[PDB]
Amino acid sequence: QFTDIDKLAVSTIRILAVDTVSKANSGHPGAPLGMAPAAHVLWSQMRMNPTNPDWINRDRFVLSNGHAVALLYSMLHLTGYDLSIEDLKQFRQLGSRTPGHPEFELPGVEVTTGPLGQGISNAVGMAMAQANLAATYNKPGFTLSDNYTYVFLGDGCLQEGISSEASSLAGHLKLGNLIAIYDDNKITIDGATSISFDEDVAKRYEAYGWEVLYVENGNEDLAGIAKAIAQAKLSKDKPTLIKMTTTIGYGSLHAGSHSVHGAPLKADDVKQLKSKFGFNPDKSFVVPQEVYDHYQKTILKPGVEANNKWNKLFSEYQKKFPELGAELARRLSGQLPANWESKLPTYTAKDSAVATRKLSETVLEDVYNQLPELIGGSADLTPSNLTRWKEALDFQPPSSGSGNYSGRYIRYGIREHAMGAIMNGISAFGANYKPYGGTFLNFVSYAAGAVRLSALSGHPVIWVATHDSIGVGEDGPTHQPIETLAHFRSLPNIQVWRPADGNEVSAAYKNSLESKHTPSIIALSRQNLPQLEGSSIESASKGGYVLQDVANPDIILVATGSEVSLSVEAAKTLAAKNIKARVVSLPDFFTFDKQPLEYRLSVLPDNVPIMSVEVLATTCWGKYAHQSFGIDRFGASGKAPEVFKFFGFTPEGVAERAQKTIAFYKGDKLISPLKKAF
């Protein structure tokens, strides 16, 4: 029941957001000024503990419309999370804790948003991840997970294909604890939504399978909002959209203009707004004691009490259910099982040639039983990507009769970007979740918005990217990656592995699965590739290593994936004409650059021409080679062996070019490419 202090709390939130922006002289005031009534009614009612932003059973909230940050920064400060008035007084300034869009890193900021469509897609991950933790561990008497996921989204989030892909998926999956409040404010940048966004959101979300509720006066009606969120929590097998109509800039002298969406309210306009709300036009960053006190009784102190009950419950759970207790206790400590690597496969030059894609399949068979925290799937290619383990159970709603919520094989359907960002949500949940998803390497580029965010945030999701090259063959150039790895090798903090054989696939799985902050893309072959006399998990784990050495080489050939194989074979050719080639396999530039310089330079030295072999774009190879053999044009639809021969990637074709590079450079001295001047 909302009293006058509930109306004083909401004026302090709107004005503190307004002051935060206008101090920085940069920012978005409109959506924070309009959603403040909702942020109050929701947080007031959210089971959280601000002294411990990591409790696993915390109600999670994602502000999908990340430009409204001053609303999250104000909510976080007033409800006793770690953020201060000086932090807010340094909004959007260099080296502050308050950047212009929310970053995962910070406390009580659950994922990082600002790309539109990303937050609501992340909250689907979080609710899936919760459905599973609860099905796995919750025993009768010990309901350890049951948190809700509350999301704030705007018109930009609904316009973007990804929220639509995600919402189709949340709907099918019956994700009943996922409440989305849509700030239906009839404005975006260009102007009004009637100019470009005018479809029936409600009829669209109902088609998906979502329950849609409505709040006619979201600017003033705390009462309404409270009853909607309340009925929304009765939605046990439907996600809910609450279409809450508000006014952009509410209170501002230009409320409803498109002008209050992304620039600070002009001085006087903040003064009239302070007056109208009962605050002083000449004072800033003012918070009444009454507000601090209110959220202390309403949120801080009961959340702590809830956290503390959850802890006693988890210890009797541990006493009762000693091994489930154990397993969850570890996932929460964030440890991978003691010595899990001992179940990763190892091969010899003696074992059969198998496509790196089938070798990926075999790892996933040996680690699913070892890691209850590994949930993953495919975006409609389970057969093609060799991405499921034989003894799996799909993540599905119990009524489907074709899986249940404890399943760990997710079927994402043809939805790459959404797969990408749901993966970040599962990851951002906690309890050591290790998410992965399979697709064809070429279409990971459809997911680029979400993949950059796994890198910026530092979320360890794994992309199992199959069909990595022209070896795809007859599907032709719409489906042969040329630029994909180059691109992702310019992205900071992502590991773009490309395993060449058995042992290079297990090292690629062990560093990805051991990663705590870098995402990963493992590019895998369609075609059969042999096992190398020289590969080993141990060496490939370094990201680049000498596969075959010669004493005193004429050339060093660095190759990745299928080309390593071709290179060894080109090296027998050159050997026969008395050229001594050293062959270096570089499975990952990331991991490799993480090595100490002395190690790297022992692989790639001074005074030796270095020529690289990779069937994709030569442009990222300048940091390791002197000359590069690669494909800088699009592919061709033919039987794959003919496509490689057509492009020249043959033992003698590589060899011929190795010869031409030796000749080109005879008599010069050559600095290693790794060496830099500053």
Ligand X SMILES: Cc1nc(C)c(C[n+]2csc(CCOP(=O)(O)OP(=O)([O-])O)c2C)c(N)n1
φ, ψ for residue 212, nearest 5 deg: -120, 125
- Identity of the amino acid at 186: K
Q: Does 30 interact with ligand X (rule: CB under 6 A)?
A: yes
Judge whether 526 is annotated as a binding position.
yes
| Nearer to ligand X among residue 30 and residue 435 (C-beta) | 30
Q: Does 182 interact with ligand X (rule: CB under 6 A)?
A: no
- 164's CB contacts (< 8 A; 6+ apart) are 158
List the interface residues with ligand X, window 255-274 (CB under 6 A).
261
Which residue in 211, 373, 416, 504 is the catalytic one? 416
Q: Distance between CA atoms of 536 and 534, rounded to whole angstroms?
A: 7
Contact between 463 and 520 (Cβ < 8 Å): yes
| Nearer to Ca ion among residue 259 and residue 659 (C-beta) | 259
Dig out the tokens for 612 from the structure. Answer: 């690289």
Kindly list the residues in this chain that would bind Ca ion in the complex (CB under 5 A). 154-155, 185, 187-188
439 binds, among a second copy, ligand X, Ca ion, none (CB under 5 to 8 A by kind): ligand X
Q: What is the CA radius of gyration of the chain?
A: 28
> What's the distance, CA 196 to chain centroid?
30
> Is 416 an active-site residue?
yes
Closest residue to bound Ca ion by CB: 155
Contact between 197 and 237 (Cβ < 8 Å): no
Dig out the tokens for 365 from the structure. Answer: 């068979």
Query: How many residues of this chain interact with ligand X, rule: CB under 6 A?
Result: 28
List the interface residues with ligand X, window 214-253 (CB under 6 A).
248
| Nearer to a second copy among residue 305 and residue 642 (C-beta) | 642
534 binds, among Ca ion, ligand X, a second copy, none (CB under 5 to 8 A by kind): none
> What's the distance, CA 550 to chain centroid?
43
Closest approach, Cβ 474 to ligand X, in A, equals 13
452 binds, among Ca ion, ligand X, a second copy, none (CB under 5 to 8 A by kind): a second copy
Strands 528-529 and 354-355: what pairing? Answer: antiparallel
- Identity of the amino acid at 640: A
Q: Does 31 interact with ligand X (rule: CB under 6 A)?
A: yes
Q: Annotate 261-324 with DSSP letters as a single string.
A: SSSPPPHHHHHHHHHHHTS-TT--S---HHHHHHHIIIIIHHHHHHHHHHHHHHHHHHHHSHHH
List the interface residues with ligand X, window 48-77 (CB under 6 A).
65, 67-68
20 binds, among Ca ion, ligand X, a second copy, none (CB under 5 to 8 A by kind): none
Closest approach, Cβ 356 to ligand X, in A, equals 18
Contact between 426 and 402 (Cβ < 8 Å): no
Among 102, 154, 460, 544, binds ligand X (CB under 6 A): 154
Closest approach, Cβ 29 to ligand X, in A, equals 9
Measured CA to CA in angstroms, residue 571 lies from 329, 444, 528, 561 at distances of 52, 33, 20, 16
562 binds, among ligand X, Ca ion, a second copy, none (CB under 5 to 8 A by kind): none
Judge whether 261 is annotated as a binding position.
yes
Q: Which of 513, 499, 508 is nearest to 461 (CA)?
A: 513
Q: Distance between CA atoms of 65 and 34, rounded to whole angstroms?
A: 13
Q: Distance between CA atoms of 217 and 223, rounded to whole angstroms?
A: 10
Q: Does 367 interact with ligand X (rule: CB under 6 A)?
A: no
Residue ranges that bind ligand X, judged by CB under 6 A: 30-31, 65, 67-68, 114-116, 154-157, 160, 183, 185, 187-189, 248, 261, 379-381, 414, 439-440, 443, 446
Give the residue numbers annotated as catalytic, written as ranges.
Answer: 416
In the annotated binding site for substrate, the residues are 28, 261, 357, 384, 467, 475, 526
In the annotated binding site for Mg(2+), the residues are 155, 185, 187
